[PDB]
Design an enzyme around this catalytic site. Structure first.
Site, PDB file in Angstrom:
ATOM      1  N   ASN A  97       7.487   9.430   7.992  1.00 28.12           N
ATOM      2  CA  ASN A  97       6.335  10.460   7.967  1.00 28.12           C
ATOM      3  C   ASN A  97       6.231  11.533   8.892  1.00 28.12           C
ATOM      4  O   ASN A  97       5.742  12.570   8.706  1.00 28.12           O
ATOM      5  CB  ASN A  97       5.092   9.590   8.062  1.00 28.12           C
ATOM      6  CG  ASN A  97       5.045   8.570   6.659  1.00 28.12           C
ATOM      7  OD1 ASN A  97       5.948   8.735   5.772  1.00 28.12           O
ATOM      8  ND2 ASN A  97       4.094   8.090   6.519  1.00 28.12           N
ATOM      9  N   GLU A 123      27.074   6.115 -10.421  1.00 32.67           N
ATOM     10  CA  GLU A 123      28.046   7.007 -10.066  1.00 32.67           C
ATOM     11  C   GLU A 123      27.935   7.587  -8.471  1.00 32.67           C
ATOM     12  O   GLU A 123      28.964   7.469  -7.674  1.00 32.67           O
ATOM     13  CB  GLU A 123      28.044   8.395 -10.821  1.00 32.67           C
ATOM     14  CG  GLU A 123      28.774   8.052 -12.212  1.00 32.67           C
ATOM     15  CD  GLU A 123      30.107   8.810 -12.124  1.00 32.67           C
ATOM     16  OE1 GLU A 123      30.670   8.940 -11.108  1.00 32.67           O
ATOM     17  OE2 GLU A 123      30.666   8.905 -13.285  1.00 32.67           O
ATOM     18  N   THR A 147       1.664   3.305  13.258  1.00 27.84           N
ATOM     19  CA  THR A 147       0.289   3.158  12.749  1.00 27.84           C
ATOM     20  C   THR A 147       0.154   1.607  13.106  1.00 27.84           C
ATOM     21  O   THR A 147      -0.688   1.032  12.256  1.00 27.84           O
ATOM     22  CB  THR A 147       0.392   3.441  11.140  1.00 27.84           C
ATOM     23  OG1 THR A 147       0.944   2.350  10.720  1.00 27.84           O
ATOM     24  CG2 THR A 147       0.542   4.701  10.881  1.00 27.84           C
ATOM     25  N   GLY A 190       3.014  -5.850   6.168  1.00 29.91           N
ATOM     26  CA  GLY A 190       3.423  -6.965   5.956  1.00 29.91           C
ATOM     27  C   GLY A 190       3.976  -7.377   4.500  1.00 29.91           C
ATOM     28  O   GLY A 190       4.950  -8.314   4.554  1.00 29.91           O
ATOM     29  N   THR A 191       3.148  -7.077   3.653  1.00 27.18           N
ATOM     30  CA  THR A 191       3.673  -7.429   2.233  1.00 27.18           C
ATOM     31  C   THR A 191       4.959  -6.541   1.740  1.00 27.18           C
ATOM     32  O   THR A 191       5.693  -6.962   1.211  1.00 27.18           O
ATOM     33  CB  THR A 191       2.480  -7.201   1.268  1.00 27.18           C
ATOM     34  OG1 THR A 191       1.540  -7.942   1.594  1.00 27.18           O
ATOM     35  CG2 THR A 191       3.001  -7.218  -0.110  1.00 27.18           C
ATOM     36  N   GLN A 218       0.740  -1.187   0.103  1.00 21.04           N
ATOM     37  CA  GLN A 218      -0.008  -0.113   0.081  1.00 21.04           C
ATOM     38  C   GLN A 218       0.740   1.211   0.065  1.00 21.04           C
ATOM     39  O   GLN A 218       0.338   2.258  -0.673  1.00 21.04           O
ATOM     40  CB  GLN A 218      -0.884  -0.092   1.230  1.00 21.04           C
ATOM     41  CG  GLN A 218      -1.902   1.076   1.414  1.00 21.04           C
ATOM     42  CD  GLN A 218      -2.881   1.098   2.266  1.00 21.04           C
ATOM     43  OE1 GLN A 218      -2.756   0.167   3.224  1.00 21.04           O
ATOM     44  NE2 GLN A 218      -4.026   1.921   2.302  1.00 21.04           N
ATOM     45  N   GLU A 228      -3.213  -7.586  -1.039  1.00 21.49           N
ATOM     46  CA  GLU A 228      -4.422  -7.264  -0.800  1.00 21.49           C
ATOM     47  C   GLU A 228      -5.125  -6.580  -2.141  1.00 21.49           C
ATOM     48  O   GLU A 228      -4.482  -5.648  -2.526  1.00 21.49           O
ATOM     49  CB  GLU A 228      -4.838  -6.634   0.583  1.00 21.49           C
ATOM     50  CG  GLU A 228      -4.809  -5.035   0.569  1.00 21.49           C
ATOM     51  CD  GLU A 228      -6.155  -4.361   0.450  1.00 21.49           C
ATOM     52  OE1 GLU A 228      -7.091  -5.141   0.591  1.00 21.49           O
ATOM     53  OE2 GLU A 228      -6.273  -3.361  -0.018  1.00 21.49           O
ATOM     54  N   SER A 277       7.797  -0.389   2.521  1.00 20.27           N
ATOM     55  CA  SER A 277       7.868   0.126   3.871  1.00 20.27           C
ATOM     56  C   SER A 277       7.959  -0.951   4.934  1.00 20.27           C
ATOM     57  O   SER A 277       7.976  -2.406   4.450  1.00 20.27           O
ATOM     58  CB  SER A 277       6.340   0.466   4.259  1.00 20.27           C
ATOM     59  OG  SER A 277       5.301  -0.333   3.674  1.00 20.27           O
TER      60      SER A 277
HETATM   61  N1  LIG Z   1       4.725   7.894   3.752  1.00 17.50           N
HETATM   62  C1  LIG Z   1       3.803   7.096   3.223  1.00 17.50           C
HETATM   63  N2  LIG Z   1       3.650   5.848   3.956  1.00 17.50           N
HETATM   64  C2  LIG Z   1       2.656   5.048   3.718  1.00 17.50           C
HETATM   65  C3  LIG Z   1       1.846   5.271   2.614  1.00 17.50           C
HETATM   66  N3  LIG Z   1       0.932   4.103   2.362  1.00 17.50           N
HETATM   67  C4  LIG Z   1       1.304   3.336   3.498  1.00 17.50           C
HETATM   68  N4  LIG Z   1       2.167   3.831   3.986  1.00 17.50           N
HETATM   69  C5  LIG Z   1       2.717   3.016   5.580  1.00 17.50           C
HETATM   70  O1  LIG Z   1       2.555   1.692   5.368  1.00 17.50           O
HETATM   71  C6  LIG Z   1       2.437   1.139   6.624  1.00 17.50           C
HETATM   72  C7  LIG Z   1       1.400  -0.190   6.616  1.00 17.50           C
HETATM   73  O2  LIG Z   1       1.843  -0.825   5.610  1.00 17.50           O
HETATM   74  P1  LIG Z   1       0.859  -0.856   4.373  1.00 17.50           P
HETATM   75  O3  LIG Z   1       1.804  -0.458   3.009  1.00 17.50           O
HETATM   76  O4  LIG Z   1      -0.317   0.047   4.453  1.00 17.50           O
HETATM   77  O5  LIG Z   1       0.478  -2.180   3.849  1.00 17.50           O
HETATM   78  P2  LIG Z   1       1.380  -3.355   3.325  1.00 17.50           P
HETATM   79  O6  LIG Z   1       2.532  -2.879   2.853  1.00 17.50           O
HETATM   80  O7  LIG Z   1       0.629  -3.826   1.943  1.00 17.50           O
HETATM   81  O8  LIG Z   1       1.213  -4.538   4.394  1.00 17.50           O
HETATM   82  P3  LIG Z   1       0.123  -5.294   4.746  1.00 17.50           P
HETATM   83  O9  LIG Z   1      -0.764  -4.019   5.734  1.00 17.50           O
HETATM   84  O10 LIG Z   1       0.315  -6.458   5.632  1.00 17.50           O
HETATM   85  O11 LIG Z   1      -0.810  -5.686   3.703  1.00 17.50           O
HETATM   86  C8  LIG Z   1       1.802   2.598   7.470  1.00 17.50           C
HETATM   87  O12 LIG Z   1       2.268   2.485   8.623  1.00 17.50           O
HETATM   88  C9  LIG Z   1       2.169   3.750   6.832  1.00 17.50           C
HETATM   89  O13 LIG Z   1       3.109   4.420   7.413  1.00 17.50           O
HETATM   90  C10 LIG Z   1       2.114   6.303   1.891  1.00 17.50           C
HETATM   91  O14 LIG Z   1       1.261   6.436   0.962  1.00 17.50           O
HETATM   92  N5  LIG Z   1       2.779   7.253   2.082  1.00 17.50           N
HETATM   93 MG   LIG Z   2      -1.187  -3.513   4.036  1.00 14.72          MG
END
Ligand SMILES: Nc1nc2c(ncn2[C@@H]2O[C@H](COP(=O)(O)OP(=O)(O)OP(=O)(O)O)[C@@H](O)[C@H]2O)c(=O)[nH]1
Ligand SMILES: [Mg+2]
Ligand SMILES: Nc1nc2c(ncn2[C@@H]2O[C@H](COP(=O)(O)OP(=O)(O)OP(=O)(O)O)[C@@H](O)[C@H]2O)c(=O)[nH]1
Ligand SMILES: Nc1nc2c(ncn2[C@@H]2O[C@H](COP(=O)(O)OP(=O)(O)O)[C@@H](O)[C@H]2O)c(=O)[nH]1
Ligand SMILES: Nc1nc2c(ncn2[C@@H]2O[C@H](COP(=O)(O)OP(=O)(O)O)[C@@H](O)[C@H]2O)c(=O)[nH]1
Ligand SMILES: [Mg+2]
Lengths: 427, 431, 44, 100, 38, 431, 431
Positions: B198, B246, B171, B136-137, B11, B63, B132
């Protein structure tokens, strides 16, 4: 920014507050529905000072309305402005105090203050930078004299830093509507002095003078008497809310007003007061305003200042004016009445200016005075309290609430220790 | 020619790729259909006989609901349907599900999908990988994709743009566990890191851009500016061009240490841009204040050991050195004893574009910095405090062992961070 | 009796690799952990 | 249930220990496209060819990469067998639990 | 202020994605002055 | 995809499911015949989570209503949303249990279990990827607290991995409509704590004060009672159906809220609760939504967390916000009420965002927080169970059903073991 | 060489000691057992086992106070006869500790000090600690000086002493004991270091920002001052200053041996972060009346002599620039017969920091010792307190029953009438 929470207790406080929340509702151009219908931008630049933002372009009071007896709150909800005060800001018990200070301060005052302490705390954190607290009640009743002062004892422990202003209604001796008044008055004045930054001693006799002789009103009811307190209400904070040549606020006057913390009992006044006959052939100028402050007649306290020495005096002018006349007049009145000021403070007069005049008027002023002659009121409560304490009369209404007698002894001790040190400063 | 494959995961990765590829389309002129209304686009866009350009990205998520909003969006006809990948069930803040039960079902589809894009590319410069650590993913599956990506190509560059746990806000609750059990494995299979919090971008936007209530897109838009200026040298002409190979060379003195700290300047509102003169001196000093850093770490607490400089817009080779001349003559900024010359200047011609609906103002010049320091080693230490006080009672671990996998990896990952923190001190000491 | 160790027991179950609650309490019955802690050189 | 539960540790230790060899093998074998490889890593480097100018100079490196995959591919086949056996004693213990 | 409170009571169901990423004008595309080929 | 099969047990259960299915049919724009009369497109995108497709553009819910009394089905079927349920999904028996936990669990529930298990299996294999099940019942009943426990105890063996939820209703000590309800209470929690994934203790007593004091309904009927629980059940699967900035689901809160398998008891809450006179006087913003979430007056559990410690906290916000003010308020309540938070788990607060607001409203959020103060609930039940059990009272009702006396003793021992386990975590040293 | 022996009196000195030698042990590098895994010879003495015995003795009239020392971590550090203990105390009765209870233990104390004194070869001074309030800390300490004066005529005896605070007091009978106490520190001492806890209370509150300290925290500052005094003895420096020199440069007349101490900086870690510290910065802190350890205002008097003890990384050039600045200030007054009033001391080793301590590690500090006429008004406040009690003969029967003549009370008061009037007329400039 600088926000005021307006406290409101007792029947009197509930009414003048509805009266106070009528003028600042009129001036700021907000209709009784809750929407702004004024014309200029300046009317809505600082409205956070009394009004709280709410969805739909509607504003709500930062006002807490408290009363032990639910009978009066139906009248506030049923006035012209009864669709503005939030019902959750209404908090009420079922039984009154019966004009007993002890009941409202100890027995049934305990169960209600938790409710009042809750909602003010909700409004404490609602705004960001509060300027202070402001309360109206009566020392001659049972709730405002009673549970009203209990909050003062509580909120001063919670927020020591914030200024506290009380526009309290001091009983008159020549016109009395209560015999246990010199009890409740003796038991609230004792509570005022340690926890209050500045007390505005308001009475009802001098207000009955003013309409009769200065306004020539043949049937001055409680409503017109409530008009004048609400006028003085806005004049105190007319500088905090608007721009001007020399701005001020509650703290600037208060530090300029209290040389020693025991002396904060004041003497408020309002300038443009003339008859309904003289609405045309009377000039609205600076010097005739100043001529109207410094009479003993316009005064809404129950003392003649000519029997004492003005310690400090503040004049808050409203509307647009050239400045030089004020310093000329304020200096002039200082020179001619040199014997009526204390020598040990020079430049006794304090001046502040807002540029905006009030609604339906071109120029306005408010005079707040600390003088010796306010001692004349406090000696004569004891002139009544001693006559009633010496025979132990009416006492058992108080001892039935669990209090002792020593509180009565120490209350007289503290007021006696007030005037004795108040008298030294006149001499 | 130059090409970059984006491998966004999660995400975070999809919503970042939403922001970046929008800026890219305005930057080269592509309509939302996929057409221009010379070959600067080839590093990002592709070619077909009818002139239609497709982006070289792969949006992956375990997801659905993150990416079905892309498929039905404004740019629904810009992307190959095959490029966007979806699994039925996610990992849900569980590194273990995404790495040992749910990843292997989907790793073979994504990898094959990667293969066709890199087949299309003749000369591939580097793989851009955004994810991130909280999710999890973005932690679990991404760690598995890196592991098999390296065995697909021994050499190819793997940049790592990352979202880190914030030091104060969070979060998620179990978020240390994914973060510690990720950098233990991706250390072997990464070439650079760009962790940004963030919280620190929250600090910048409210303080500089006068948005008291931003949204995730506002943070997303700033990230798009960062990735633009990195690759801007590859795309458009310039005085001193720089490639991914570089800056990688002049940013990591040891393979052990590949966690830089990025910074941008200027980030100011148009009301603040109308009244303020912007010069090359004024923007380069703003890259050094701690209040402009996008990791909650103070370079005053550490010592710079490598710095890379990216100038972009209306800049002149003369004024670049004088700004660097003043920057060197200040004792609040420190350097290790084994780095007297620690700069690398890139100068580009094109000023960055603006996105209406964005927040940044139109400016004629900008800088981007990548300062590897040891002031980042304090950030790992806070993670160890929280992780150790949680692993003591052994909470949330029944999810990790009960999904599958071992408990031995849990012990091995924590101490490897003790080594990494210890390694940064050997740089920190001076001889 | 001296209660049972509902933290050390859980940590031991996790280390053994027992995740389901039924298996957790079966491991409790197997290995209860209860806090029994409730009660020649001359120098000159 | 105990032996079934105590076997979840023993089952799970084996796929990763198998999975690590899968990734360890390909690195020794190298990239699938020699054009993705083509860099300092090949056996036709400029460095080695310079050394090949003198007669009798060559490399034994191209046989030690053989013996690296010798034991590596061998160990997976022994590892796959131990894995597959251990699933049978998991399902048969699970089935007998149902009858009990 | 009139706009700030008038733009409150609307049936503004939509994803923040669709309210954030519209179709951009063709006038605001980049001109791409500096480019490599002739 | 990710579907839910709505289980439903008891007169308490059958009424809530009728009310709960009302608010989802209203939100997705489903008229009582079943067709879609809504306006948007997102209102039919993830409908398949709850609804099965039928011919003619018809949706029927994935609900299985069960009961031991035939008169409750007719009242349900005679409601407004009566002909929306497929008739075969009703399972009702000829003879009732009558507030006895034993009759519903061995004697008469054993003939009805096979028929429900036929139905639920058909609905289980109907969808490709079940997210999990969900049941609602009361623990003072005879069928929901009886066969319902036997219902869960079976299908855990059939479908181990699937998610299990229960919005169970536990009897209150202050108000009770049963004399024998602790026997139903104690012998059900032991079965519950063995086989469930998470729970929500919604007590009719606590919802009585909330309509007494906050909504100020003169005549709060059971309809006004079960409107509040229905918003709570909708407010957990909310991110599942609508896209959000930061999504969640049933499992993501599940993994993040239960450190150990025995602790899955939560106290739910709902923020937008305001009376009619307070509809005029309000500025619906994020702090005003948070300030109502944490005052213990809002809870639908019969225990004050002020006497306990907040183990973990989860909050799911519904609407379109700036997630900065999402993250500021949760951090504030973390530091102000620090004594009310455990110390061996840092950042106990978990957040997620769903963009689509609840229909007719703009701002809302639901709270799922695990505390140790719910131990106050259990010890009040064991206060009465041993009071009755010392006199061997009401026992011939249970003994004549074929059960044994020791089963009472073991269920109290397990119940005492749980409250001896939670309590030790209250008095647990982090360092 | 240089060797120092300590004679801690009463409850005050022993708790004063516990902070001191715990600081001293970490100053040199000893372990609590007494072994190091010759700067220590001033304070430790090498023994048979290679162990270092500290040259100290504790004399106390109640068993519990020094029992804690015999059972603490430093139980094996110390030699048991050096912990001298009494069965029964004076109980704040100067008569008892002078006439009745002391004389049972007077000769035992003189044995143990002489045995340590025989170990040393060259002695410079005795550093002894006591108070003016308690009986044992005043009466027992009074007589031992009178014997110690005739036992060591030439040896120095510093007086680190607690002055009863002007406002806060932990007893009622303090002024009677103190007026009796002064004769000892008048005719049988060479220096004195009176201090009230009230001013140490203020500086911790105002600067250290600790609102809830204990008697340990004040004690940590006291040892640091003594650490600064003896830093010349223990370690090398640019300008080493022995005590007799400190005695020579600070006492104008035989009667006036009452220096006042001052330590700068005393700053916490958070306040140290934003404040760079210079030699000019630290010397101004010593002359601010807010940081004085005695509640007297130096600006109400003038300075007769000052002793400076700089420590850490200091350079003599900055010292004179610091010194010259202090002269060019009309706020600071000096007596006319003092053209130069300073003793500047330089050391190399910075003051240490204790784990669990309060002061941050600062590279440079300063001690201060000024002989001013400010302390004159403190005695006149003590004389009135004694006066308004004595006229009505309060509490006299306790001391009379012990066996002092009542005329000694009047004779002692005359001495302070004599002492105060010397201060006032000395302060008068003869010009
Ligand atoms: N800076 C920033 N952080 C994001 C953004 N979207 C999600 N995150 C971060 O992603 C963290 C949660 O992981 P996600 O990316 O939402 O979900 P995921 O990586 O698919 O992993 P799962 O929840 O297990 O499916 C949150 O704590 C956010 O801080 C974004 O658009 N910008
Ligand atoms: Mg997620
Ligand atoms: N600063 C400081 N003052 C102390 C300490 N201990 C005692 N005092 C002071 O000593 C005074 C009383 O004397 P104590 O030291 O307590 O006891 P004593 O000296 O043995 O005298 P007696 O109690 O009569 O036996 C009190 O007023 C304290 O202010 C200490 O550890 N630090
Ligand atoms: N100034 C003023 N006084 C009022 C008004 N209404 C009542 N009072 C006075 O209030 C006094 C009685 O106060 P009471 O209601 O008993 O106070 P409470 O017991 O605190 O509620 C009477 O002496 C009245 O003169 C009003 O509108 N204005
Ligand atoms: N909150 C709530 N509780 C209910 C409702 N209907 C019944 N109950 C509770 O459920 C209990 C009776 O349940 P019961 O009919 O015996 O359940 P059954 O035996 O499984 O059919 C009573 O204590 C009620 O308080 C409802 O609509 N809402
Ligand atoms: Mg003592």
């Amino acid at each position: 920014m600088r926000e005021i929470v307006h406290l409101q207790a007792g029947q009197c406080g509930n009414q003048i507050g509805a009266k106070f929340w009528e003028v600042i509702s009129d001036e700021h151009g907000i209709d009784p529905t809750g929407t702004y219908h004024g014309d200029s931008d300046l009317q809505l630049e600082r409205i956070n000072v009394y009004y709280n933002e709410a969805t739909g372009g509607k504003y709500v009071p930062r006002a807490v309305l408290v009363d032990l007896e639910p009978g009066t709150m139906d009248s506030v909800r049923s006035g012209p402005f009864g669709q503005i005060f939030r019902p959750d800001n209404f908090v009420f018990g079922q039984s009154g105090a019966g004009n007993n200070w002890a009941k409202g301060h100890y027995t049934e005052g305990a169960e209600l203050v938790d409710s009042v302490l809750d909602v003010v705390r909700k409004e404490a954190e609602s705004c960001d930078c509060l300027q202070g607290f402001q309360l109206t009640h009566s020392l001659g009743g049972g709730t405002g004299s009673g549970m009203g002062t209990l909050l003062i004892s509580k909120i001063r422990e919670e927020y020591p830093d914030r200024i506290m202003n009380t526009f309290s209604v001091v009983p008159s001796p020549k016109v009395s509507d209560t015999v246990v008044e010199p009890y409740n008055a003796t038991l609230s004045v004792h509570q005022l002095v340690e926890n209050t930054d500045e007390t505005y001693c308001i009475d009802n006799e001098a207000l009955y003078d003013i309409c009769f002789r200065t306004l020539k009103l043949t049937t001055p009811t409680y409503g017109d008497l409530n008009h004048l307190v609400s006028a003085t209400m806005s004049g105190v904070t007319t500088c905090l809310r608007f721009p001007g040549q020399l701005n001020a606020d509650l703290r600037k006057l208060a530090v300029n007003m209290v040389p020693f913390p025991r002396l904060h009992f004041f003497m408020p006044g309002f300038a443009p007061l003339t008859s309904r006959g003289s609405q045309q052939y009377r000039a609205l100028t600076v010097p005739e305003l100043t001529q109207q402050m410094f009479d003993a007649k316009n005064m809404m306290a129950a003392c003649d200042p000519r029997h004492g020495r003005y310690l400090t005096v503040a004049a808050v002018f409203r509307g647009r004016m050239s400045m030089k006349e004020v310093d000329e007049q304020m200096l002039n009145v200082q020179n001619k009445n040199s014997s009526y000021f204390v020598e040990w403070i020079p430049n006794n007069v304090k001046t502040a200016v807002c540029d905006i005049p009030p609604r339906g008027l071109k120029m306005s002023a408010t005079f707040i005075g600390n003088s010796t002659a306010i001692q004349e009121l406090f000696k004569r409560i004891s002139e009544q309290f001693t006559a009633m304490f010496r025979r132990k009369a009416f006492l058992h209404w108080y001892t039935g609430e669990g209090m002792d007698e020593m509180e009565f002894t120490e209350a007289e001790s503290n007021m006696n220790d007030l005037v004795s040190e108040y008298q030294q400063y006149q001499d | 020619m130059r090409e970059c494959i984006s491998i966004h995961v999660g995400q975070a990765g999809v919503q970042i790729g939403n922001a970046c590829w929008e800026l890219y389309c305005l930057e080269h002129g592509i309509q939302p259909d996929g057409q221009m209304p010379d070959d600067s686009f080839n590093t990002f866009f592709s070619e077909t006989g009818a002139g239609k350009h497709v982006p070289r990205a792969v949006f992956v998520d375990l997801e659905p609901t993150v990416v079905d909003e892309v498929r039905t969006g404004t740019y629904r006809q810009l992307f190959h349907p095959e490029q966007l990948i979806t699994g039925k069930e996610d990992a849900a803040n569980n590194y273990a599900r995404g790495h040992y039960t749910i990843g292997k079902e989907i790793v073979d589809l994504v990898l094959d999908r990667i293969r066709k894009l890199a087949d299309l590319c003749t000369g591939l410069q580097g793989f851009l990988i955004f994810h991130s650590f909280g999710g999890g993913t973005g932690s679990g599956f991404a760690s598995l994709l890196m592991e098999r990506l390296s065995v697909d190509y021994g050499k190819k560059s793997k940049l790592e743009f990352a979202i880190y746990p914030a030091p104060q806000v969070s979060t998620a609750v179990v978020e240390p566990y994914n973060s510690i059990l990720t950098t233990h494995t991706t250390l072997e299979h990464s070439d650079c890191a760009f962790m940004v919090d963030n919280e620190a971008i929250y600090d910048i936007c409210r303080r500089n851009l006068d948005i008291e209530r931003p949204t995730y897109t506002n943070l997303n838009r700033l990230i798009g500016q960062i990735v633009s200026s990195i690759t801007a040298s590859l795309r458009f002409d310039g005085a001193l061009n720089v490639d991914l190979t570089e800056f990688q060379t002049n940013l990591v003195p040891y393979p052990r240490i590949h966690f830089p700290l990025a910074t941008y300047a200027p980030v100011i509102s148009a009301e603040k841009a109308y009244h303020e003169q912007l010069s090359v001196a004024e923007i380069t000093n703003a890259c050094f204040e701690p209040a402009n850093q996008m990791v909650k770490c103070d370079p005053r607490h550490g010592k710079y050991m490598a710095c890379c400089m990216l100038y972009r817009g209306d800049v002149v080779p003369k004024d670049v050195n004088a700004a660097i001349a003043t920057i060197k003559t200040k004792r609040t900024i420190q350097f290790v004893d084994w780095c007297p010359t620690g700069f690398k200047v890139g100068i580009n011609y094109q000023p960055p574009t603006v996105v209406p609906g964005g927040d940044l103002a139109k400016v004629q010049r900008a800088v981007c910095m990548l300062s590897n320091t040891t002031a980042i080693a304090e950030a790992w230490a806070r993670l160890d405090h929280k992780f150790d006080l949680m692993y003591a009672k052994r909470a949330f671990v029944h999810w990790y062992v009960g999904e599958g996998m071992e408990e031995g990896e849990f012990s091995e990952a924590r101490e490897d961070l003790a080594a990494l923190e210890k390694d940064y001190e050997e740089v920190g000491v001076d001889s | 009796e001296l209660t049972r160790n509902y933290i050390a027991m859980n940590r031991g179950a996790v280390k053994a690799g027992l995740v389901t609650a039924r298996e957790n309490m079966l491991y409790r019955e197997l290995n209860d952990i209860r806090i029994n802690d409730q009660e020649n050189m001359t120098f000159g | 249930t105990m032996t079934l539960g105590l076997m979840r540790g023993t089952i799970h230790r084996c796929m990763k220990f198998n999975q690590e060899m899968y990734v360890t093998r390909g690195i020794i074998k190298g990239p699938l496209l020699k054009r993705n490889l083509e860099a300092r890593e090949k056996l036709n480097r400029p460095l080695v060819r310079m050394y090949q100018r003198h007669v009798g100079t060559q490399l034994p490196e191209a046989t030690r990469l053989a013996q690296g995959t010798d034991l590596l591919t061998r160990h997976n086949l022994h590892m796959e067998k131990n894995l597959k056996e251990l699933r049978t004693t998991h399902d048969n213990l699970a089935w007998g639990l149902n009858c009990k | 202020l009139q706009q700030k409170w008038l733009a409150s009571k609307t049936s503004l169901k939509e994803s923040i994605y669709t309210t954030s990423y519209p179709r951009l004008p063709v006038c605001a595309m980049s001109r791409r002055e500096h480019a490599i080929p002739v």
